[PDB]
Design a protein around this ligand. Structure first.
Ligand SMILES: NS(=O)(=O)c1ccc(C(F)(F)F)cc1Cl
Length: 209
């Protein structure tokens, strides 16, 4: 059973801008998603300081980067706090309407797309490199859900029948045909070293057969 939702008009506008603007510095998508992962890990760590049972769904706090050249996907997995179904529908836990408004004013006032994370909507930079994004998530207070969008104004949400996650979020980037450099080990390593050197969780880059 799949539910289909329309993006708020302002978020559809943000996604179209990300997809249509000529902007060569696409690599910042990975910094933005790793930063969201770290924020999510901070949240469950803070909750665990006063309630250790919040880690019963998994004590390890980490980020994994999983390229798959056969599927042409880059997956970013974190064991952070996760998202409820309500969170997913509400723009993946962001204040995306007000963040988009601030972001587009900044762009007309000299800013560039790499600054997206300062406006709290960095998730949508995934569409710099992905034709489709799937988000699998598990929050302690809800079931496991799958969010998905190929832009075009709509997204779907469904209960996830896939591999149980324990707790956290998995962002699956179905990469555009000309963006497969982000599946190469040396390219991913370079981006992590450049932009994510001060992330306070282990970032493990998986290798492929
Ligand atoms: N930037 S991201 O897609 O890797 C991401 C990571 C974690 C979370 C959450 F907080 F919910 F766990 C949400 C997102 Cl959207």
């Amino acid at each position: 059973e799949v539910e289909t939702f329309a993006f708020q008009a302002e978020i559809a506008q943000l996604m179209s801008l990300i997809i249509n603007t000529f902007y060569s510095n696409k690599e910042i998508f990975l910094r933005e998603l790793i930063s969201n992962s770290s924020d999510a890990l901070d949240k469950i760590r803070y909750e665990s300081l006063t309630d250790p049972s919040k880690l019963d769904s998994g004590k390890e706090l980490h980020i994994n980067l999983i390229p798959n050249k056969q599927d042409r996907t880059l997956t970013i997995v974190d064991t952070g706090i996760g998202m409820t179904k309500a969170d997913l529908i509400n723009n993946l836990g962001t204040i995306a309407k007000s963040g988009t408004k601030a972001f587009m004013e900044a762009l007309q006032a000299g800013a560039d797309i790499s600054m997206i994370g300062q406006f709290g909507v960095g998730f949508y930079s995934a569409y710099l490199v992905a034709e489709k994004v799937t988000v699998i998530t598990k929050h302690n207070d809800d079931e496991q859900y799958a969010w998905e969008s190929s832009a075009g104004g709509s997204f779907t949400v469904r209960t996830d029948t896939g591999e149980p996650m324990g707790r956290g979020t998995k962002v699956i980037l179905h990469l555009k045909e000309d963006q497969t450099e982000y599946l190469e080990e040396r390219r991913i390593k370079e981006i992590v070293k450049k932009h994510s050197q001060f992330i306070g969780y282990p970032i493990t880059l998986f290798v492929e057969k």
